[PDB]
Design a protein around this nucleic acid. Structure first.
Ligand code: MN
Ligand code: MN
Ligand code: MN
Ligand code: MN
Lengths: 247, 241
DNA sequence: GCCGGTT
DNA sequence: AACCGGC
DNA sequence: GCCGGTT
DNA sequence: AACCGGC
């Protein structure tokens, strides 16, 4: 990670930080503001990075050619926008924040990519693990890493900002940081109903995986396929059986 | 619908207004059907305020006088229990309905969907196909076939400089649509997805029929998704394990 | 504690 | 509660 | 037109 | 992008 060396800083700055009454999505901006101040040459919003990539290559027009600028099938897959959106891009028609985008922030350096999400949590409310990332997208990601042998190109990490309502604004009370690729893949909770999302709180994320990036991919694909099989038959029991009587 | 007879009115007041764009409608409905119109959370408060005698969740759950409505409108046991005149419910993202209209102990559940017609059409989550399944099951077990409708109002808008402007609307009734026509997007939180404007309204049977017909559709689509899971999520990745 | 459905 | 983009 | 994954 | 409640 690029932000880990200064995490203790981020942690200490964000704590006690307040914002005017995700619900706490103004806390993301602080993290981005901070990143952009201490690692400014590394820090991008995902759309910002796409904009920079294309601005550096004005000659390169069309989606075909523009996709080539990625030098990576897995990154092309995680990062790019659609073909018409890419074809249509211009200095006048730049990319903007996109609901669906994979990552909140990109830390890039020497061709190594850290995709960073900021999750925000209302510590008052009962714990409810948030959607992290699509288990399916993650399966595809794992398959593309293996097919193209990209096991040393990018990490997917998380920064959780705990907050509470203090009078008339939100205040951050603590944070956590975890690395997707350091967890035991077979331990990832896939919530099929919840748009097929891996779900957890960062603070709970296991961080003891031992093998290589390749082994993680293989093991996650095993876990995915197993959970998918289980869910298939588990659907008959929960969504069919209970209703058969009425028909 | 209580809304339908005055749809022209609504349409006419909304078209051209300026400001996802959370668009009133509530305002209009309130100022024209005051004693019929409620946010969901507000209707809950109303119900409990009107019965200070009752306390505890079990007792206040009886105030609904309907297993189905209880299923659709009520908060959890604890939050009900802890409800107080000095501790009211607030808007909850999770609530079934945007607006509830009730007259003569009949309920119209109204969602207001918004839509940027500048962008390319993408059917929105409407309601959980699994929630709807439980709903029809409850309607049948409890013979509540004349109690509530679930209806939708689509506000089409478009960005003009600084201000976002409504430029058309649609209204449909869920229980007038061909149940087997309803698109159940499993991956999308098991949601029914449609735009209102596109919603079949040619159903002619009874409420009971609709419910039984829907459950048949649901059970069928659940099996199909179960099976489809193998091809979509299993075979494509086996070559790696 | 464990678990998964909904906006 | 929306939201894009493959073919 | 058709269809369905993601934040 | 997060959000409750059943036992
Ligand atoms: Mn993101
Ligand atoms: Mn975020
Ligand atoms: Mn609603
Ligand atoms: Mn709405």
């Amino acid at each position: 990670s690029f932000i880990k060396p200064i995490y203790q800083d981020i942690n200490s700055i964000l704590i006690g930080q307040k914002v005017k009454r995700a619900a706490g999505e103004p806390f993301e901006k602080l993290v981005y503001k901070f990143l952009k101040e201490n690692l400014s040459d590394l820090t991008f919003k995902q759309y910002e990075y796409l904009n920079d990539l294309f601005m550096k290559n004005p000659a390169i027009i069309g989606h075909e050619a523009r996709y080539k600028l990625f030098n990576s099938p897995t990154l092309l897959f995680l990062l790019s926008r659609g073909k018409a959106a890419t074809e249509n891009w211009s200095i006048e028609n730049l990319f903007e924040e996109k609901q669906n985008d994979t990552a909140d922030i990109l830390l890039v350096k020497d061709q190594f990519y850290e995709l960073l999400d900021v999750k925000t949590r209302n510590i008052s409310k009962s714990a409810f693990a948030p959607n992290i990332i699509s288990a399916y997208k993650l399966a595809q990601t794992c398959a593309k890493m293996i097919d193209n042998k990209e096991f040393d190109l990018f990490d997917i990490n998380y920064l959780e900002v705990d907050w509470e309502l203090n009078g008339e604004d939100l205040v951050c009370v603590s944070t956590s940081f975890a690395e997707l690729f350091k967890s035991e893949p077979s331990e990832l909770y896939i919530n099929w109903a919840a748009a097929m999302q891996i779900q957890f709180h960062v603070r709970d994320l296991d961080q003891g995986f031992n093998g290589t990036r390749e082994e993680w991919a293989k093991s996650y694909l095993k876990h995915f396929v197993t959970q998918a099989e289980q869910r298939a038959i588990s659907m008959i029991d929960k969504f069919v059986k209970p209703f058969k009587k009425y028909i």
